[PDB]
A paper describes a structure:
In the case of σs, a specialized adaptor protein RssB, also referred to as SprE, is not only required for direct recognition of the substrate but also required for its preparation and delivery to the AAA+ protease, ClpXP. RssB is a response regulator (RR), and as such is composed of an N-terminal receiver (REC) domain and a C-terminal output domain (also known as an effector domain). In contrast to most RRs (which contain a DNA binding domain) RssB is linked to a protein binding domain, and as such represents one of the small groups of RRs (~1% of all RRs). Nevertheless, like most RRs, RssB is phosphorylated on a conserved Asp residue (Asp58) within the N-terminal REC domain.
Overall, the structure consists of five repetitive (αβ)-elements which form a parallel β-sheet (β2–β1–β3–β4–β5–) sandwiched by two helices (α1 and α5) on one side and three helices (α2–α4) on the opposite side. Similar to several REC domains, our structure of RssBN formed a dimer in the asymmetric unit. However, in contrast to many RRs the RssBN dimer showed an anti-parallel orientation, which is mainly stabilized by β-strand augmentation via the terminal β2-strands. This orientation is different to the biologically active dimer of several RRs including PhoP from E. coli. Superposition of RssBN onto the RssB/IraD structure revealed an r.m.s.d. of 1.4 Å. From analysis of the B-factors of RssBN (which resemble molecular flexibility) it became obvious that the last helix (α5), in particular, shows higher mobility. This is supported by the observation of limited hydrophobic contacts between this helix and the core domain structure. Significantly, Arg117 is located on the mobile α5 helix of RssBN, which is directly linked to the C-terminal domain that makes direct contact to σs.
Residue numbers in the entry:
A (entry chain B): 1 to 126
B (entry chain A): 1 to 127
The structure:
């Protein structure tokens, strides 16, 4: 199959339009249905009414650091799988993400589209 | 001002990746914060918990014709401004969109990005 993610809903939270388009383009290519949010506060609001199969965010977020997004939904009882894609070198931040429950924390810029591919597959078909 | 839509939340419902990306690019360029949905059923679900300043959709939608999206939110009592962008030539479909309450129905493909610009401005800053 060239579209193995058909039937999967992916929430992408990404403030850079180009990276946002690449991620939409890639996941859509694979058959996923995407929701994209430019802003992490807007994503928090969306998650009130909607439950995706996977959420992709950055923990180093300009408007509102995505750790707080993660913390707020995890306090509610949301078990939504989260994959972090981040350039952060800050080990206290990564450790806080891991304690809140993320599938993984992948380095940005993505220097292996091969790896993300099987990381996304590890999340969506465990 | 080169970013006149700062503080405006726009929901874009668009099944074509490239057009989706163009609209994201354009609205983001003008300072709006965007939410994009590939799929109209997912947009119906999102609107349960979220109220944008403007929704952009096509009435001629593959998965689920966007008239039903429009009819379902309008039966709830949502006053969310909607702008339809569509190549539809079907006068009955346009007329149903207009009865449901739509800011306007703009012809696709978009000749002219000047027009969409002030159409979007009429929706987001009326009077």
């Amino acid at each position: 199959m060239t579209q193995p993610l058909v039937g999967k809903q992916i929430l992408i939270v990404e403030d850079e339009q180009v990276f946002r388009s690449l991620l939409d383009s890639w996941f859509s290519s694979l058959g996923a249905t995407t929701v994209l949010a430019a802003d992490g506060v807007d994503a928090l609001e969306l998650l009130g009414g909607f439950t995706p199969d996977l959420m992709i965010c950055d923990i180093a977020m300009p408007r509102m650091n995505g750790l707080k997004l993660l913390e707020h939904i995890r306090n509610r009882g949301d078990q939504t799988p989260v994959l972090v894609i981040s350039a952060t070198e800050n080990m206290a931040d990564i450790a806080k993400a891991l304690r809140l429950g993320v599938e993984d924390v992948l380095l940005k810029p993505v220097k292996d589209l091969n790896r993300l591919r099987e990381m996304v597959f590890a999340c969506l078909y465990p």
